[PDB]
Amino acid sequence: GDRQGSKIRTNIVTLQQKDESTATDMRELLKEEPSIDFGGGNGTSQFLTLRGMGQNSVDIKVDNAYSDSQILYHQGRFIVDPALVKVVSVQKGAGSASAGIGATNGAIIAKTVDAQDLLKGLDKNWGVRLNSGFASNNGVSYGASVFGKEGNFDGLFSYNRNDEKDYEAGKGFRNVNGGKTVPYSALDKRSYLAKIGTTFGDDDHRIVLSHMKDQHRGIRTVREEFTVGDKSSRINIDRQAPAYRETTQSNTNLAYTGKNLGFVEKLDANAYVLEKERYSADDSGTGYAGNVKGPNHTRITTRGANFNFDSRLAEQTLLKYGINYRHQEIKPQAFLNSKFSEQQMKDRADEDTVHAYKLSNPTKTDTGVYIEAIHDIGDFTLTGGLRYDRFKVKTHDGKTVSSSNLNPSFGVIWQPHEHWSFSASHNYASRSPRLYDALQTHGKRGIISIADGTKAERARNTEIGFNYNDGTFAANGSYFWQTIKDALANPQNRSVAVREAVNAGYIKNHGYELGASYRTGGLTAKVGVSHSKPRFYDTHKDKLLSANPEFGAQVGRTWTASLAYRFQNPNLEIGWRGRYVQKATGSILAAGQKDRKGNLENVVRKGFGVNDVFANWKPLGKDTLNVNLSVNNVFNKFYYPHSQRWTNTLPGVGRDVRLGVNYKF
Amino acid sequence: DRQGSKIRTNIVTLQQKDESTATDMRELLKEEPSIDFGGGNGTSQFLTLRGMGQNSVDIKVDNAYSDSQILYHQGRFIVDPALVKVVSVQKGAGSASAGIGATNGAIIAKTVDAQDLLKGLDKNWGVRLNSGFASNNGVSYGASVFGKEGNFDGLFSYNRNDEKDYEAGKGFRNVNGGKTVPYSALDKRSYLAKIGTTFGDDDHRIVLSHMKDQHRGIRTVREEFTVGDKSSRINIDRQAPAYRETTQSNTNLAYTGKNLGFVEKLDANAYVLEKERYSADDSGTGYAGNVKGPNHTRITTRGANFNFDSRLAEQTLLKYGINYRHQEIKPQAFLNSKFSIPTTPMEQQMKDRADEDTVHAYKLSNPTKTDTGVYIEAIHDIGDFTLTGGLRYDRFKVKTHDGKTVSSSNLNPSFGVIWQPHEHWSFSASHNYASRSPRLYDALQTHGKRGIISIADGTKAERARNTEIGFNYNDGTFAANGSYFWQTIKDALANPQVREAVNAGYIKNHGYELGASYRTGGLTAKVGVSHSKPRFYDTHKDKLLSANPEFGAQVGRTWTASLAYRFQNPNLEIGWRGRYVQKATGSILAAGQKDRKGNLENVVRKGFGVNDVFANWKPLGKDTLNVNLSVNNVFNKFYYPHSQRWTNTLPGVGRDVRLGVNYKF
Amino acid sequence: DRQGSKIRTNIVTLQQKDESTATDMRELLKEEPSIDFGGGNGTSQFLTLRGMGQNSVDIKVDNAYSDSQILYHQGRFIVDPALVKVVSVQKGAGSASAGIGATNGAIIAKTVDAQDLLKGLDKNWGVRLNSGFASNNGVSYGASVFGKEGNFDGLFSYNRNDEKDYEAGKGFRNVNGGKTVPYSALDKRSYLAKIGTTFGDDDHRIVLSHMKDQHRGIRTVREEFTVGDKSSRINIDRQAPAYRETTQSNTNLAYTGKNLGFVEKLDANAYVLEKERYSADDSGTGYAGNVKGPNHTRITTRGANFNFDSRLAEQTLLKYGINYRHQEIKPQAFLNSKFSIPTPMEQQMKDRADEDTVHAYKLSNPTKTDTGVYIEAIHDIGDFTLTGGLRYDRFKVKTHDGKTVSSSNLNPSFGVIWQPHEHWSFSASHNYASRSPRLYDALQTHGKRGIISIADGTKAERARNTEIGFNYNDGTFAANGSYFWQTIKDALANPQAVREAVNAGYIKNHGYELGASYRTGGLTAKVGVSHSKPRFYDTHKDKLLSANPEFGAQVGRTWTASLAYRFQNPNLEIGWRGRYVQKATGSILAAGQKNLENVVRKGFGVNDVFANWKPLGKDTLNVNLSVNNVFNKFYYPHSQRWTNTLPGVGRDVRLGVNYKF
Ligand SMILES: CCCCCCCCOCCOCCOCCOCCOCCO
Ligand SMILES: CCCCCCCCOCCOCCOCCOCCOCCO
């Protein structure tokens, strides 16, 4: 099983569990997980943090494809729709050698659903699955899926839609027209999956071809992390200029797995193309896009491939080795550059420089080779590995800078008794600079480059853990220490017309997680707690590190608990679930954060509890029909989650009563 | 049905509807002489019952209904008959169990169910496909899947009707000199999703339902008009056509329990009904505040109804229950601050300048209206008399967009007698009181850019006093019915008095309806005639009632007739149908209506007659396959219907040849 | 087929199309040397046949076709092959039964039917799913449901093809220095709805059918160009991209009765064809009158055809029938009143009197009515088949000023086929046909730029097409050849404040086509070449004929070939396909196009490799892999303007799957 205490949590959500839930986003789906925290709002209003660390350092992997770029820092990076997914797992902090590219701070890892998963409940080779959803606060959802198998072939198509209105925050929230809803938080969210696959050669070989699309549309504000405030605020209707928007994530993926190949005992490979888009119907009121009148379209394309081989050197020792490749390219619609604008000469001088550049699409190439030995001796499992990682960054001025890193990793698990493991690991990993914001790449605000020696961030993550499980009771614990050198955030002047990415500091993180469960005769009891302390230490004279929630947030210590009971007759689980986040204090920046004026901020944030009760009934006895009812945020709590800025941005959803149905025939 | 012609239950049956070629209520209910629809597609249409408009008459689907509107230049939304299984009608003030607002009657529809679709089939699941062509000018299709497992049942239906600009009858010429009515094309879609359980000896049922009904296309600001000459008020610039979606959605939870002791039967309903207007650009829409780019306007209607039947004795039933409805209108944004009165002269701009300040100073909230009623009704059979007594207590509460709140309440008695002396005869009389609360202002004007719309301090509900008599003859071959009615309605409200909603006068209506039918060996013959005379008497100094079609129309005496013959081999029915409306004369306003420049309008409306031939064949003898052929408006008559404005707005559909197949397996 | 190469029936089969990865006609018909398509996506494309453009060549689906256009800066709409079950081609002037306007030929397509989809299945209903992936750069999918109960049948197909800006071949650079062609992305959707009945000993059939084909995306004013440098006439401002939908719809009622006695066969068709352009904002569109906000422009085409075959004797068939078509263009609004000539004085005064006249016109939707009656006798004697025919064609044009002008024509046709041996045919035909004036551009009909009328005597174009051919086929080897000569009198192009459609010259064309094939046990080899020479000759003093690609292009001599092997086990065909077009020279204008242009168009080759696999052996599952333009060749095709408009798609790797159950 999982034996690194709490640092690798495999299959946190299973498809069969997910079908008993009423959630239609990751935020509600992973709320029992204390180290994970989502900001408020719909879609890409949301930021995610893991052990306090943001999506600058934590990735969401679906079918083993992931970008590390972003569209705009006033919104978070795209979070996949769980309707597509069959499993979610998590890996925290710096990973081992087989972990892939950029594993400094960890990842949400998801696999899309397959034909065999959907056929599960049925006694035949094809099937249909319908679902619908109703939410009082305030949405409607449905989907369908058709799937099957003939000879050595299988396939599926799933369409899902979730049409969500402006959500009502908890009690006491008032929106400036004096309503209870959060302006421009409506989103029409659609996804599809198309898969075809073949399994051949004694079932030891499989090729799967997959296309996924995940899309959000609606009238959204420039800056999705805020709504519209009072006309006297910086977040008023004019500055925030809502306009129709679509933001999309698409992935075509080819995947192969072979087993018992003689020359190797298992091989996994993946080649994909991931597209991230922003489309806006009018960008006149969008400063960041260069105020581009009418439709505007921004792309990020990610091409990747991974190969992974497992070779057995002896009954007790496995050798994993492989290679990762990823290329990312950002495409503005048009470069804007030529439009960039008593001793101002120095400025006309600057003006003439920007105009003089001829800009190209920025790219970034990451590649890595790795080996890992996993050796079992006595009731110890020892893991040794190494990665060699290089990147190359070509910014929009054509400037190219690369570097490379050698990253060792060591891990021990000890399992003395059959109910016990204990763990320790010491993992190094590196993470290449990120390209600037895709939406700002047109270069209208000046040129964004990279300094000559700039290098990758490099993490040294040490941690210990234990797992207990005796079949009734379970528990796990993790303590971790993280240092990351050469952190990069905002660019340095070389006057503010031309700037360069630079290493600018270091990062500390440390903390703990506990979890326990109790299982008997239909009763399922659970508790968990997590606290961590991300800190960003400026090292550069112009202090360029950032408290942008993308990097992290100092989240309150977080408790979660659940209590559920499953009746033998009728087949019905009812239960309660709560999440309590304590009061939090302090910026992620050790020197503190400022305020557009430049003034110290006394970052404080309130604790709050959210409580939910739910029910799953299975009127037919099988998992072919699920009727689910939930009432989330029972007490209609008014609150702001912690992973976002601390000023009063976007509250949690007020109370919400949901009825979902899925049905398989 | 024994109130002569005042309650017509099941005017349209599903099995009849499958033999028809109609795709809207207007064509479906054309044999009904008291019902009249204005010209044009979708919400261009106004409906009148006994000459009374959608201000006083509601369409109820699954016992959910709003009384609000989007904009007075269009009619209120008329459900797609593709969704429905039955249509019924109740005219004038209803009895106590009728629900909220029953002063003038209602079209009442129920959506289709699993058991209705399984009708023709000898199994527990099925599919239904349909297809339609219309020469003038459209194409339609749909599919439906439905079934039953254990105590469960469900269905999904999709229907689409893609209609082009229609050609009017002969001699119509459109201003480019074409024969089609500009911007009358609509792409009309509907869905139904339902899931239900029947349990407990078949005496209990819970059904959960979602319906969506949507029209899209390039439509004019003001759908009651097309585009006229560039010299008219209805020219291309003023009418500024643009893409639009207008939508009716309902999620509905319905419960019925039977044989529960003291309660012989219980019916209950809780629902959320959404009405929406979406426009892709509202720059040329004055009424929306000339809002540039996309614009959404919402009306949300939450309701619940509970209804109990208790049996006090074998001949007496007691009905009692409670109705609750909350309506809330949501503009996309209040506009308030941009209130502006042009100079254009005149030299009394003074007070203007003042009013401009008045208006910018408000803070506006979404208007709401809450209606609630408790009622009791006894139905007593003695000798060959059936007596009905009832009472309703109704209250409302109106919160306008300035936050002002005004309520009132009413106690509404109702008495009804049916006498059935012979088995072929009934005679009837009723004396029914009912009330109807003020309507909220137009949803699309709620933003307040044209000024503040409030409600005066003592304003109260309209109150109807409807007396009527009737008879029903039926001997198995020959049938007939007749109704005479008289209607007084006190405290009529129309245009506001910052302006406020006030009571401004009273309404009269009287008239009659006769019908008769003749059925014997294959032949079926029918006739019907109806005439009413709605009159609106001003009481206020500013004359404040309105000749808007919403309120009503003086419609010509209307005759309908049909003759059809069902052959036995093939199973084929061929028939003629005709509808003839005589010339009508006045305004609905007793003192006369005035034309923009304030002059009295000499309201005159031509008579016309429309003839239709149709055929229904059943190639297999069962009802599981219908092939329907029709030609409507055979003589390609050019005319204007009466329920709309009298100037020449939107003509009837010219001649139209239609083919429709439905098939169920 | 026995007219050498002039009539190619069933060039594309449904069964073949299912093994292909192509999602447009251009890639589907690339092995056809006489057909050439311009560069770009959707209506950026021009078609030529024997060097003749869409001004004279039609696309007929289910025997319905318009001859009107939206705007001359884009080509006429080309149907999506996802709808079709067959494509066929008829070149030059047709015989009498060919329909209206058959001066220069037509691509001919039939939409798919229930029986075609049921093909591989052993039951009365079925589903078909498909998906596509394209590296450069798109994704596609669709679904179809279909069946049969008693005497009746029906189908619904939906198809969608979401295409990104395409990357051109190597060395192309776009002005932001990318490799993609700006605004060449299109979201392309089609659906088909059909219901039919077959009755009366299977000798009678009625089919009702509705089809819609639609392209949407951000597109430029003038789709034949992208966006060039800000110093060019094709810069971002002039080209003002904006959201656009362009749509072809057809509702069709079709009847066929057989062996009805005297009448051996009857085919009839009555249909309504809609062509539509919708734009979200036309402010930067000069041609639409700079109409602010949404704008939509329509062309409606109502037609009917009736065709009878009567057998006068075992050896002689008589065909006769009648063709009717009405076309009406509808602007959103006439604009007429705002005509304005920019500000010498002596011309100014003329100018200001001009706008007064324009402003006095009250304008109506232009219409055109075409009708024709025909008879053809087909007579078989010895090993000769002789064909004699006659058409009488009239038209009536009502332009936007209400002016009406008609003419009529009597068009004879003669054809001989001689089949001396069973492996041999030889052919000749001498066919006259006429083609009525086309209405001005739909999108310009508003008349803001002035009034567009028709001169008093103007008449139809009239083609005299003579040609010879041969067909060899012995079961293993096959070859065909065609030579043709075309003269067309009274060509019309550009108008003579108030301007007038006129006859302004003539057109000549000649050339050849040759094909050859070789088929032996799984192996299939094919080659072809085609060369033609369209030439427009001004007759009018103001030189009025046009070099726009609508009318044609001097394409380079074109070679195609392919080589494929089909293995028995697995059921896999792999092959190669080439299309090389030689360098070209010259205008279609005999006197040259203008400031005189020396027209030169470079040659190029395109190579593709492809595989089709049937993992189940039935035709119910096809897995398709192709790589088109393997060597990533950078080029401009010839059926477009010679300047450097829109290049060939670069290299593109595709996988497509269809499955039937
Ligand atoms: C618009 C983007 C969203 C749609 C996603 C689909 C796009 C196309 O993707 C291609 C990937 O292939 C999926 C294969 O599905 C087609 C084959 O159907 C299944 C037949 O195989 C079952 C064999 O028993
Ligand atoms: C200018 C006039 C000529 C126009 C002709 C165009 C006609 C358009 O045809 C297609 C649309 O048809 C829709 C109406 O459907 C009529 C159905 O009649 C068919 C009878 O079939 C009997 C079944 O046994």
Numbering used by the authors:
A (entry chain B): 60 to 400, 417 to 569, 572 to 742
B (entry chain C): 61 to 404, 415 to 567, 575 to 742
C (entry chain A): 61 to 403, 415 to 567, 574 to 671, 676 to 742
Can you list sentences taken from the study reporting this PDB entry?
Development of a vaccine against the serogroup B form of the disease has focused on the outer membrane proteins (OMPs), notably the porin protein PorA and, more recently, factor H binding protein. It is also known that other OMPs contribute to protective immunity, including the FrpB iron transporter (also known as FetA), which has been a component of several outer membrane vesicle-based vaccines. FrpB adopts a classical TBDT structure, with a 22-stranded β-barrel and a plug domain at the N-terminus, located within the lumen of the barrel. Sequence variation in FrpB from different meningococcal strains is mainly concentrated into a single region of approximately 40 residues, which is predicted to lie in an exposed location on the outer surface of the bacterium. In addition, we show that FrpB binds Fe3+ with high affinity, and that this binding site is separate from the antigenic region.
We obtained crystals of two different sequence variants of FrpB, termed F3-3 and F5-1; these variants differ in sequence predominantly within a region of 30–40 residues which is predicted to be surface-exposed. We initially solved the structure of the F3-3 variant by molecular replacement using the Shigella ShuA heme transporter structure as a search model. The FrpB F3-3 structure was solved by molecular replacement using a search model based on ShuA, a choice based on output from the program BALBES, although sequence identity, at about 21%, is still low. Analysis of the self-rotation function suggested that FrpB F3-3 forms a trimer in the asymmetric unit. Solution of the structure verified that this is indeed the case, with three FrpB F3-3 monomers arranged in a similar manner to that commonly found in porin proteins. The use of non-crystallographic symmetry averaging was valuable in obtaining electron density of sufficient quality to allow building of the loop regions of FrpB which differed from ShuA. This enabled the complete building of nine external loop regions outside the β-barrel, leaving two incomplete due to weak or absent electron density: these were part of the region of sequence hypervariability (residues 401 to 416) and external loop 8 (residues 568–573). Despite substantial sequence differences, the HR region adopts a similar structure in both the F3-3 and F5-1 variants, consisting of a short helix at the N-terminus, followed by an extended strand which packs against a C-terminal helix. One reason for the consistency of the structure of the antigenic region for both variants is the conservation of a group of residues at the base of the structure, which pack into a small hydrophobic core between the C-terminal helix and the loop, and consist of Phe399, Ile401, Val432, His433 and Y435 (F3-3 variant residue numbering). Some residues were missing from the electron density at the tip for both variants, and were omitted from the final structure.
